[PDB]
Amino acid sequence: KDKLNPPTPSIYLENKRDAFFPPLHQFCTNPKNPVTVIRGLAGALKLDLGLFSTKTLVEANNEHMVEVRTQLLQPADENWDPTGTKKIWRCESNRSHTTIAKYAQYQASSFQESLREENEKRKGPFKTIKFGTNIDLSDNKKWKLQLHELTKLPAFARVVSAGNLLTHVGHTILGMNTVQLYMKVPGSRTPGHQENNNFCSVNINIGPGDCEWFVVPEDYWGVLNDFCEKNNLNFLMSSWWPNLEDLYEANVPVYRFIQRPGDLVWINAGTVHWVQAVGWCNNIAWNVGPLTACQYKLAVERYEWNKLKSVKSPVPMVHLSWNMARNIKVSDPKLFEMIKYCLLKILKQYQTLREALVAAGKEVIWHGRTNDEPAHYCSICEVEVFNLLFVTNESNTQKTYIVHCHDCARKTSKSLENFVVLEQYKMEDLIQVYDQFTLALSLS
């Protein structure tokens, strides 16, 4: 079907009015639109993309760290096994580190070398390329002008905003509520994935070259998971590059489009995607969590799925949920009932655990909390741990407070005799937050 190669939801901006126009906000967050390409976004805002040029980055922080992925330069939209014999899903992507100055040097000489080849005139085997990924632009002192330029965006697409759930986490989640930079040469590939905890993603192409994007709606992610599992690949942890003929045969629709310099790509919640550089360019990206039932639901679902797959969730959805209930007036009936349900479950599980401890003669020690203290995770299994923290007798005495979850503490120490139980929140206070959390009226 042509329904298997659908058109890209695409908004064409001319000026600031178009960018700040509220139906643009609603369009991007509509669950029916897996991706929105906002064309001409930088131009409409007079964004200085030059602040993100390789030349400026070198001058700014030439020793800054870059995660290098070394890859094969693959043809078009395909991924071949190294012997050029068959198209496979697994892609080779070895990791090392470099600096902006060193990667910049390669980016520039790669282009000069391509110019000479174009002037030398005229299955693999395949050349090797390097992709500069995940460059951390969280330090406002090192990247003042860069980060300030992005406050010019409409609020819904900003790294920080009142309506961004990731703003409401209350602490830094690297690469999610902080900007990541990518420095690319032709063929630089970001393999298939969903965002961390299915949060939306915002990507701007700095240029000067284009990127090519591949997008599959969230509700087909199970199909791609089976493909991975049948191909001996971890959907969440392995590097894979879909066979478009496999997807077509399985009746999976694939959105496919070009992102030009200054185009902003909005990846909606849970949308599966992979990307390749067509030319030489940089990109900047971060996540955003719109206050919708769809975003919260997909975030919760991935959070729970990660536990089953023994994968850490970068977004602490328990911590977030209490912050939402404490600080956000929620007027969507569906969203409200989702949050209320989740808090009630947290609350009851917590009450059950606490009572089991008390009834077994285990003491619960009041530990309180520092405000804006990040969520905790289990030092062993990396699950989020909320309120009741399990700390060894020695870590307690040393006041290092190395957190464990209950299961891991119990597996270590059968009667928890090697652990103390630290309580960060009084129950009455949590019950109060829950009770005071009611549906706000909005006429919108």
Ligand X SMILES: O=C(O)CC[C@@H](O)C(=O)O
- Closest CB to ligand X among 181 and 317? 181
- Asked whether residue 405 is marked as a ligand-binding residue, the answer is yes
Please, what sign has the CA dihedral across residues 76, 79, 85, 86? negative
Spatial contact of 302 and 62, defined as CB atoms under 8 Å apart? no
- The angle subtended at Cα 266 by Cα 343 and Cα 444, nearest 5°, is 55
Which one of 8-16, 68-76, 249-257, 377-385 is the stretch in contact with Zn ion (CB under 5 A)? 377-385
- Shortest Å, Cβ 204 to ligand X: 9
DSSP state of 87: B
How many other β-carbons are positioned within 10 Å of the β-carbon of residue 301? 15
Which amino acid, residue 61? N
Of 74-82, 116-124, 195-203, 241-249, the segment contacting Mn ion by CB under 5 A is 195-203
Q: Please, which residue, 128 or 400, has the CB nearer to Zn ion?
A: 400
Q: Which of 267, 291, 378, 391 binds ligand X (CB under 6 A)?
A: 267
- Residue 319 annotated as lining a ligand binding site: no
**Binder among 104, 169, 285, 335 for ligand X (CB under 6 A):** 285
- Quick one: which of 378, 389, 422, 430 contacts Zn ion (CB under 5 A)? 378
Residue 269 binds ligand X (CB under 6 A):
no
State the binding partner of 389 from ligand X, Zn ion, Mn ion, none, CB within 5 to 8 A by kind. none
From candidates 4, 258, 347, 380, binder to Zn ion by CB under 5 A: 380
> Distance between CA atoms of 150 and 29, rounded to whole angstroms?
20
Q: Is 195 annotated as a binding residue?
A: yes
Terminal Cα distance for the chain, rounded: 38
H-only helix segments in 360-426:
393-397, 406-412
Question: Considering the rule CB under 5 A, would residue 408 count as an interface residue with Zn ion?
Answer: yes
- # binding residues, ligand X (CB under 6 A): 8
Candidates 201, 205, 282, 387; binder of Mn ion (CB under 5 A) is 201
Among 283, 292, 295, 387, binds ligand X (CB under 6 A): 283
Selected from 275, 298, 299, 315, the binder of ligand X by CB under 6 A is 275
Distance between CA 260 and CA 121 in Å, rounded?
28
Q: For 236, how many CA atoms within 13 A lie in the half-sphere containing its CB?
A: 15
Integer angstrom CA distances of residue 175 from 180, 257, 381: 6, 24, 22
Strand order in the sheet with 10-12: 10-12, 35-39, 264-267, 200-208, 281-288, 180-184, 128-136, 65-72, 93-99
Q: Was 97 annotated as part of a binding site?
A: no
For residues 95 and 72, what is the distance between their CA atoms, to the nearest angstrom?
A: 13
**Residue in the structure block whose two tokens are 């965002």:** 195
Positions at the binding site for Zn(2+): 378, 381, 405, 408
Q: Which residues make up the interface to ligand X (CB under 6 A)?
A: 182, 190, 201, 203, 267, 275, 283, 285
Q: Which residues make up the interface to Zn ion (CB under 5 A)?
A: 378, 380-381, 405, 408
Q: Which residues make up the interface to Mn ion (CB under 5 A)?
A: 201
